[PDB]
Design an enzyme around this catalytic site. Structure first.
Site, PDB file in Angstrom:
ATOM      1  N   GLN A 149       2.708  -9.214 -15.849  1.00  0.00           N
ATOM      2  CA  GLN A 149       1.796  -8.287 -16.492  1.00  0.00           C
ATOM      3  C   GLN A 149       2.567  -7.107 -17.063  1.00  0.00           C
ATOM      4  O   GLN A 149       3.520  -6.646 -16.420  1.00  0.00           O
ATOM      5  CB  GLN A 149       0.737  -7.798 -15.475  1.00  0.00           C
ATOM      6  CG  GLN A 149      -0.245  -8.961 -15.169  1.00  0.00           C
ATOM      7  CD  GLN A 149      -1.398  -8.576 -14.282  1.00  0.00           C
ATOM      8  OE1 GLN A 149      -2.030  -7.502 -14.446  1.00  0.00           O
ATOM      9  NE2 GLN A 149      -1.764  -9.420 -13.295  1.00  0.00           N
ATOM     10  N   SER A 201      -3.898  -7.245 -10.974  1.00  0.00           N
ATOM     11  CA  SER A 201      -3.844  -7.820  -9.621  1.00  0.00           C
ATOM     12  C   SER A 201      -4.083  -6.829  -8.496  1.00  0.00           C
ATOM     13  O   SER A 201      -4.532  -7.241  -7.424  1.00  0.00           O
ATOM     14  CB  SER A 201      -2.463  -8.438  -9.408  1.00  0.00           C
ATOM     15  OG  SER A 201      -2.254  -9.496 -10.328  1.00  0.00           O
ATOM     16  N   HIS A 214       1.001  -1.933  -6.906  1.00  0.00           N
ATOM     17  CA  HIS A 214       2.273  -2.428  -6.410  1.00  0.00           C
ATOM     18  C   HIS A 214       3.236  -1.275  -6.151  1.00  0.00           C
ATOM     19  O   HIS A 214       3.134  -0.246  -6.816  1.00  0.00           O
ATOM     20  CB  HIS A 214       2.960  -3.324  -7.443  1.00  0.00           C
ATOM     21  CG  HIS A 214       2.154  -4.411  -8.070  1.00  0.00           C
ATOM     22  ND1 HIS A 214       2.418  -5.747  -7.859  1.00  0.00           N
ATOM     23  CD2 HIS A 214       1.121  -4.342  -8.954  1.00  0.00           C
ATOM     24  CE1 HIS A 214       1.554  -6.468  -8.594  1.00  0.00           C
ATOM     25  NE2 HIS A 214       0.756  -5.638  -9.254  1.00  0.00           N
ATOM     26  N   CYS A 229       0.603 -10.367  -2.043  1.00  0.00           N
ATOM     27  CA  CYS A 229       1.159 -11.436  -2.879  1.00  0.00           C
ATOM     28  C   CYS A 229       1.784 -12.522  -2.020  1.00  0.00           C
ATOM     29  O   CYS A 229       2.366 -12.220  -0.968  1.00  0.00           O
ATOM     30  CB  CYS A 229       2.224 -10.829  -3.813  1.00  0.00           C
ATOM     31  SG  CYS A 229       2.972 -12.005  -4.946  1.00  0.00           S
ATOM     32  N   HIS A 241       8.488  -6.857  -4.457  1.00  0.00           N
ATOM     33  CA  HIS A 241       7.366  -5.956  -4.582  1.00  0.00           C
ATOM     34  C   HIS A 241       6.475  -6.087  -3.344  1.00  0.00           C
ATOM     35  O   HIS A 241       6.579  -7.027  -2.564  1.00  0.00           O
ATOM     36  CB  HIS A 241       6.548  -6.142  -5.859  1.00  0.00           C
ATOM     37  CG  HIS A 241       5.648  -7.350  -5.847  1.00  0.00           C
ATOM     38  ND1 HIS A 241       4.395  -7.258  -6.394  1.00  0.00           N
ATOM     39  CD2 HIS A 241       5.836  -8.605  -5.372  1.00  0.00           C
ATOM     40  CE1 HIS A 241       3.827  -8.440  -6.261  1.00  0.00           C
ATOM     41  NE2 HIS A 241       4.653  -9.296  -5.656  1.00  0.00           N
TER      42      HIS A 241
END
Ligand SMILES: O=C(N[C@H](Cc1cccc(F)c1)C(=O)O)c1ccc2ccccc2c1
EC number: 5.2.1.8
Length: 113
Positions: free
Chosen positions: A81, A104, A107, A63, A9
């Site tokens: 998640q 977060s 993505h 990330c 990702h």
């Protein structure tokens, strides 16, 4: 559905993310709007062929998986998640998601296995 999928990702955080800091920036200052603009511009460059997914993730993902060129490894349901999980499991291997929203940030996901 397989028990687990493997995905890479690219995460773009914003100033209202759960943890608005990353290895890239001590404080994430971009707006939610700017984060989605960046995500959509990455999608467009990957679709045109200008950029490679994992090459982009390695330098531009917020990330820590950027160090592994975006790879998260395998995961089952009930781990990530929920919006991330649902998007990941709905992909075929070799397919990339559109924008996926979590606490977060935003993505794009590439399923690899
Ligand atoms: O503004 C750029 N990046 C932005 C701003 C930014 C955020 C975090 C780290 C950083 F180096 C830069 C982004 O990645 O969100 C930027 C600026 C010049 C570039 C030149 C070549 C390729 C990518 C480039 C990217």
């Amino acid at each position: 559905e397989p028990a687990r999928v493997r995905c890479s990702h690219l995460l773009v955080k914003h100033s209202q993310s759960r943890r608005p800091s990353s290895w890239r920036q001590e404080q994430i200052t971009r707006t939610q709007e700017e984060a989605l603009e960046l995500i959509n511009g990455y999608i467009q460059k990957i679709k045109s062929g200008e950029e490679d997914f994992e090459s982009l993730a390695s330098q531009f993902s917020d990330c820590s998986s950027a160090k592994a060129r975006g790879d998260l490894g395998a995961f089952s349901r009930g781990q990530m998640q929920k919006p991330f999980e649902d998007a990941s499991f709905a992909l075929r291997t070799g397919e990339m998601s559109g924008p996926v929203f979590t606490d977060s940030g935003i993505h794009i996901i590439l399923r690899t296995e």
